[PDB]
Every structure is written in structure tokens, then in C-alpha cells.
Design a protein around this ligand. Structure first.
Ligand SMILES: C[C@H](CCC(=O)O)[C@H]1CC[C@H]2[C@@H]3CC[C@@H]4C[C@H](O)CC[C@]4(C)[C@H]3CC[C@]12C
Ligand SMILES: C[C@H](CCC(=O)O)[C@H]1CC[C@H]2[C@@H]3CC[C@@H]4C[C@H](O)CC[C@]4(C)[C@H]3CC[C@]12C
Ligand SMILES: [Ca+2]
Ligand SMILES: [Ca+2]
Ligand SMILES: [Ca+2]
Ligand SMILES: [Ca+2]
Ligand SMILES: [Ca+2]
Ligand SMILES: [Ca+2]
Lengths: 111, 302, 304, 113
């Protein structure tokens, strides 16, 4: 893997249910903050949840994130899904300048 | 005595986006006291904010560009900003180098590039650059440091060198100041104002080339004065004798007075207007100076 | 008394390509009497050639654009020209709408486009447009009609509409007038000149974004006056009181006189220069009007 | 065919030899002038020979052109080839505005050993 971070291009969940996104990265990015971002433009996206560069699980409202720093994967969960949750999201790694980011499109199926 | 260039607004240059002035209007529904940083000049000729003399500097920047391929992002540019005349940029009492964009969104910029790739050498490359309002790119034009990128499956093999980035398009335009210093405060030209009760800002309008995947509506951007007025005041260095100038905006071929207004010394024009929605004016008139007047001078309504 | 704006050349706007002025020079090896059509103004304020007031109009054009896909060419733009303030273009005693490029080569231009395709709407599209010197495109900006294209495998599904084409790059630049009317002569501002013996044109220089597959050297373009001087004369409408103007170019902090020169009434500056190669000058001086003078006034010469 | 005119993307000849280029076009362009152009920029290329919209031969210097308006092919012949002949050339159809054109790269080398 040459990219710093990769994920699923698309992910689907059902209204009122959940979805999970595995943001896989390469070992050099272990000690960096990881985050889950929403919307466009890409680099002014809204951070929904972010780690503190440890393996501590973080949850903010309906979004959770945890960085597995052995396997180098941070997992995002979104729960109690709403149709308005559909759209463009990003796996992100915080660094100086341009953050590594990976575009994830979220689709929501009703009922 | 102060005079003004004899130029119709429609033949003038916009002071915040490099394009003609197309519109002249008041609109009380828009923010009343915008904190624009370009197109800001005192009647005594003092440039304010990041306002340049030359229209060509508007919404542009100059830099020593350094390029690095970043797999999964593309070719990344680190721009070490200079002033657009080539002199060194030094952080000081304004937000950024002269002419640097004073609005937000994601800007496409064009720069000259040079490649080592066999079979070509010079071309123009379009980069994307996030301006603001907040970003995760840690933009710091106040520190002379900004970042841009271009999608590329592999390295473009660019040669580092001096560029002048000019604006191709805006995406997600917001008329709010960009990220000048990685989230920190910077010295700014103050909000435009104050206005007397019932006074509103006169706006010179142009339209910005745009990316928008759903809406075809034009992207308006307003400024307080055409760029020709900026260079006029900067050249003439008039002495101010009161707090404002009474102007008449007139058709010179008809004699028809279209309105009177006040140019406050601080470089913005007010009309007395009580309407709720926009009122546009013809762009083929001429502004003529009538007299010095005090701040409290009361204008005839339009 | 006639005067000039108190602005250093390095803070001025170029009058033939939309960019800063970067250089101030003489070069006797260059064509001595160029027939530039932009950056041309009389000291009495009369705009000459296609010169516009606003620097934003320089090397641009406005049009009603009609698009049609042509297999083997791509998406073809037929541009029915208008003036850049939106007013109708009327053929008269100049080459083209105001601001129209007055050089040759192949121009990349940028315009706003609107597509009907699902999933987008507005974007900016780069077209290629041949300017001259001679072309097989039958360009006729004098008639208000020019053609451009962008390579596309299938239609871009563009919606016809008004555009303002701004220049992105030049390829194969030649400083010679473009095809203004399908190979026919058009009304032109005359060649710049005449000059007294020993006088050469003072040049304001900028550099053009370029495509060049083999050579990295910058592409210089000269003009006779910065755009701020054009709008200054057009705004002031000074009265002519003799044949020419004697100017001094001075550093205003040190007081150093760098040279004297002559602004002929027809809008170009002559320097008396006795060297053979190019000579550049500092760009942080100020031009000041001294006096009206006759055309035959002999300047103090600048040497090697 | 759907493109108006197609040629050989690459054609190679040898010093002192000859080569031919078939510029094949669609039937609607039968009664248009055909030409062979040299150099870049594309649309200011140098026209070396142009027909008069008939099937009559035209020859200038070492270059010939002949339109066949039954098979809809104009053939260009370049004779007594020289290394300096190598470069970018174009099949062209003259029309108002943008001519249909097709880029032909001409390569020239010496006869082997
Ligand atoms: C995009 C173009 C700018 C080019 C630039 O210069 O770089 C400008 C030129 C003139 C503008 C139109 C003016 C009339 C209309 C005004 C109305 O309030 C909004 C729509 C309206 C049709 C505008 C759309 C944008 C235009 C076409
Ligand atoms: C490409 C830029 C133009 C962008 C424009 O504004 O849009 C300009 C900025 C200033 C120019 C350089 C000036 C110094 C040198 C001058 C010398 O005679 C030629 C080389 C030299 C190094 C130039 C190269 C072209 C530059 C980099
Ligand atoms: Ca960052
Ligand atoms: Ca930051
Ligand atoms: Ca929009
Ligand atoms: Ca022709
Ligand atoms: Ca070149
Ligand atoms: Ca043609």
C-alpha cells in the first residue's frame, strides 16, 4: 500500500441502524490523530469525531472512532442512521499541511 | 480638491475578483459591514488591508513553489509566498501578501509549471487550494505559507520554481475571510462602516467563474470601490478636509441625476435607502464630487 | 499641466497580457516599430487600436457561445463576439472588440460552461483557440466571429450562453498581429514611431504563461505604456499643447535621475540609447513630466 | 466512418525514397478542397499542397496530392525523402471555420546498414 490511508469507496446503512467503516493506514501514521469528516469542500469538511492519537475509543453523538495502533486501522461507526446522513465523508489523518484523506460515500436505505 | 476618475462603472475593474464591474446596487438584506480586505483604500490614498495598486494582483499570489508527489493526494505544492512584484513578503500589519484572496471556498489556481518528463517542458497546471473559512490544510498566508494540490496517479516530475497563481474558478464560495493564519487572528482592515441610520453600502458587483454540480446561478461578489478608484487615490494622495464627500452619480449624456451618495473618507460609499430588497442602478453613469460634508450629512433617499 | 500617476512601474499592470509589469528596458535588436493594438493611447486620452480602459479586458473577449460536438475535433465553440461590458460589437475603425489579443500563436482560454449531464452543472472549461498569424480557422474577430475547440471523445453537453474568455497560456507565441478578418487587412493603429536617430522604444515587459515542449525560457511580451497610464490619459483627457513631453525617470527616495525620455503625443516613450544589446532599468522609479517639447528635441543619451 | 478524415498516425520512410499517406474521409466531404499541412501550431500549419476540390493532381516541390472522390481518399505522396522532412503533418479538409484535420507523424531514417 502506497497511499497513507484507504477505505471503502461506498458504504450503506439502513435508516435507524448503523454502519461501520474501516480506515486502513500504514504504520508510519500510528502516532497521528485520526478523524471522520463530513461534506465538501473536502478540506473544509466538518469533523464529526477525532482521536487523540491513542487507541482510546471516542464517541460524539452518533459517531464513534477507535484507532487500532497494532493493525493500523481506525474504525468508524455511525448509528441511528438518518436519510440526511447520506453523502460524502472522509477518513482523515491529522498532520501539518494537507491531511491524508480518503473519500467514502455513504448511502442510506429507508426503513 | 478631491476629484474622481471620469470612468463609467461598467468600464471599470473589480477590486476583489479579477473581472469587469458588471453591477452597481444596494441590497439591505446582505451583511451590512463586510470585512473585505481587498478593495480597501482611504480617500487620502492609504491602502488598507491587503489591497494592491494593480488590478492584476487581485485574488492572486506569487510564490516560490515546491512540489512533492503524495500517493493518494497527487502532486502537492508548498507555496512560500512573496509579494507579487517579487519582493520578499514579511508578516506585518495586514493579513497576507497584497492581493491575496479575501474570501472563502476552494479555489482552482493556474500556475506555470516545468516538467523533466521526456517530450515536454512547460505547461500550465491547475491546482486546487482550500482558502477557508476554516480548513484542515493549516493555511497560513500571513506566515507566507500555503498548500495546494493536483490529482495525479503518479508524479508530474515538476521543477520547483517561482510562480504567480491566478484564479480559475471558485467552489463553495463564501464571502467570509479565509484562513489567514492557521486559525489565529491577524491584523485586518476593520468592518466597512459605520453608516447613518437608513444608509446602506453601495456595491460594485462582478461574477466569479464557478464549479457547482447542481445550481447554475451566478456567483456574485461585491466590492466597495472599483480598482481604478484605489489607484486614483493612491496616486493623488489627496488631503481630506472633512469626514465624507458628497457625490452625484449622473448620466453625462442626459444630465439625469440618478442618485447622490456619501463617500466616507474610509473608502466606502453610502446611499440612503429604506427598501428591503436589492435596488440596482445603471452602470453607465459617472460619479462627480460635489463637496466635503460631515459624517452626519443626511442624503436624499433613493 | 499634464502629469502622470505617481506609481512605480513594478506596481503597474501590463497592457497587452493580464499580468504585472516586471521589466523596463530597451532592446535595439527587437522590431523597432511594433504594431501593437492594445496598450495604445493618445496623450489627449483617445484610445487607439483595440485598447480598453480596464486591464481586466486585456487579451480577453466576451461572446455569445454556441457549442457543437464534431467527431475528430471535439467540442467546438462558435463565439459571436460582444464587447466585454456586454454591449453589442459594431465593426468600425479598429481591428476587433476592445481587449482582443493583438499577438499570434495558439491560446488556451478559460470560460464558464454549463452542462446538462447528470451529476454536475457548472464548471470552467479550457478551450484552444488559434489566433494567427495566418490560420485555417478563418478567424474574423473584425466580423465578431471566432472559433475554438476542446478535445473531447464525446459531447460535453454544453448549454449555449454568454462567456468571457480569459487567457490561460500561449503556445507558439509570435509578437505579430493575429488574423483579425480571415486574412484581410483591417483598420489598425499604426506602427509605433517614428523615432529620432538614436531613439528606441522604451518597453514595459511581462511574461506569458506558456506551453513549450522543449524550451524552458520565459516568453516576454512588451507594451508601450502600463495600463494605469492608459486609463489615466483616458480619464484626464489632457489638452495637447505641443508635440511631445519630456519626462524624467527618477528614484524618489534617493533623488537619482535614471534617465530622461520623450513621451510622444501618440502614446510611446523614446529613450536615446547608444548601446547595442538590451539594457534594463530599475522598476521602482517614478516618471515625472518636465515640459512640453518639440519632436526634434534631442535627449541626453544613455550608454552601454 | 464517423470522423471526417483519418490518416496514418505514424508513417515511416527512408532517405531518397518515397512514402504515401492515405487521408480517408466520409462521403459528405467529397466536394471540398483537400490539403496536406506541415507543422505546429496545428491551425497555423504550413499548407504544402491543396486540391481545387476536383480529382486533379496537384504537385509542389516533392509533395503530391490526389483526391479520389469515388473511394473518398486523398493520397499524398512525398518523394526523394530527406531527414529534415520528418515531423508533424496533417490531413486537412478546407471548410469555413475549423477544418477537419488528422495528425500524421512522419518518421524518416536512413536505409538500414
Ligand atoms: C460569468 C460572467 C463573468 C465572466 C468574468 O468576467 O470572468 C458574467 C458576465 C455577465 C454576467 C451576467 C450578467 C447579467 C446577469 C446578471 C445577473 O445578476 C446574474 C446572471 C447574469 C446573466 C450574469 C451571469 C454571469 C455573467 C454571464
Ligand atoms: C512566470 C511569472 C509570470 C506570471 C504572471 O505574472 O502571470 C514570472 C514572474 C517573474 C518572472 C521572472 C522574473 C525574473 C527573471 C526575469 C528574466 O528576464 C526571465 C527569467 C526570470 C527568472 C522570470 C521568469 C518568469 C517569471 C517567473
Ligand atoms: Ca492538516
Ligand atoms: Ca489547523
Ligand atoms: Ca453556486
Ligand atoms: Ca481563411
Ligand atoms: Ca518558448
Ligand atoms: Ca477553415
Amino acid at each position: 500500500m502506497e497511499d497513507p490511508v484507504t477505505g471503502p469507496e461506498e458504504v450503506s446503512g439502513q435508516e435507524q441502524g448503523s454502519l461501520t467503516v474501516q480506515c486502513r493506514y500504514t504504520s508510519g501514521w500510528k502516532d497521528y490523530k485520526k478523524y471522520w469528516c463530513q461534506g465538501v469542500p473536502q478540506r473544509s469538511c466538518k469533523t464529526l469525531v477525532e482521536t487523540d492519537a491513542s487507541e482510546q475509543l471516542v464517541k460524539k453523538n452518533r459517531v464513534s472512532i477507535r484507532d487500532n495502533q497494532r493493525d493500523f486501522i481506525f474504525t468508524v461507526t455511525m448509528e441511528d442512521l438518518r436519510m440526511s446522513d447520506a453523502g460524502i465523508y472522509w477518513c482523515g489523518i491529522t498532520k501539518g499541511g494537507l491531511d491524508p484523506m480518503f473519500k467514502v460515500t455513504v448511502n442510506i436505505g429507508p426503513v | 480638491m478631491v476629484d474622481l476618475p471620469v470612468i463609467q462603472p461598467r468600464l471599470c475593474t473589480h477590486a476583489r475578483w479579477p473581472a469587469p464591474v458588471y453591477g452597481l446596487l444596494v441590497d439591505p438584506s446582505l451583511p451590512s459591514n463586510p470585512q473585505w480586505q481587498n478593495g480597501r483604500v482611504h480617500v487620502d490614498g492609504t491602502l488598507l488591508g491587503t489591497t494592491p495598486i494593480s488590478g492584476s494582483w487581485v485574488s492572486c499570489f506569487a510564490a516560490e513553489a515546491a512540489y512533492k508527489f503524495q500517493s493518494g493526494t497527487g502532486e502537492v505544492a508548498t507555496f512560500t509566498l512573496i509579494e507579487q512584484d517579487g519582493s520578499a513578503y514579511v508578516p506585518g500589519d495586514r493579513a497576507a501578501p497584497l492581493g491575496y484572496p479575501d474570501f472563502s471556498g476552494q479555489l482552482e489556481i493556474e500556475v506555470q509549471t516545468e516538467t523533466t518528463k521526456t517530450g515536454d517542458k512547460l505547461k500550465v497546471t491547475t491546482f486546487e487550494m482550500i482558502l477557508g473559512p476554516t480548513t484542515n490544510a493549516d493555511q497560513a498566508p500571513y506566515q507566507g505559507r500555503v498548500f495546494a494540490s493536483v490529482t495525479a496517479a503518479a508524479s508530474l516530475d515538476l521543477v520547483d520554481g517561482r510562480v504567480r497563481a491566478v484564479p480559475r474558478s471558485i467552489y463553495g464560495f463564501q464571502d467570509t475571510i479565509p484562513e489567514y493564519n492557521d486559525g489565529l487572528l491577524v491584523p485586518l482592515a476593520p468592518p466597512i462602516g459605520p453608516f447613518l441610520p437608513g444608509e446602506v453600502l453601495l456595491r460594485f458587483r462582478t461574477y466569479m467563474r464557478q464549479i457547482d454540480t447542481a445550481d447554475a446561478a451566478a456567483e456574485a461578489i461585491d466590492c466597495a470601490l472599483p480598482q481604478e478608484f484605489v489607484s486614483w487615490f493612491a496616486s493623488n494622495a489627496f488631503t481630506v478636509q472633512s469626514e465624507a464627500l458628497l457625490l452625484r452619480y449622473r448620466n453625462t449624456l442626459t444630465g439625469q441625476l440618478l442618485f447622490e451618495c456619501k463617500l466616507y473618507n474610509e473608502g466606502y460609499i453610502a446611499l440612503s435607502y429604506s427598501g428591503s430588497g436589492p435596488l440596482t442602478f445603471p452602470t453607465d453613469g459617472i460619479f462627480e464630487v460635489v463637496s466635503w460634508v460631515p459624517r452626519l450629512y443626511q442624503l436624499a433617499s433613493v
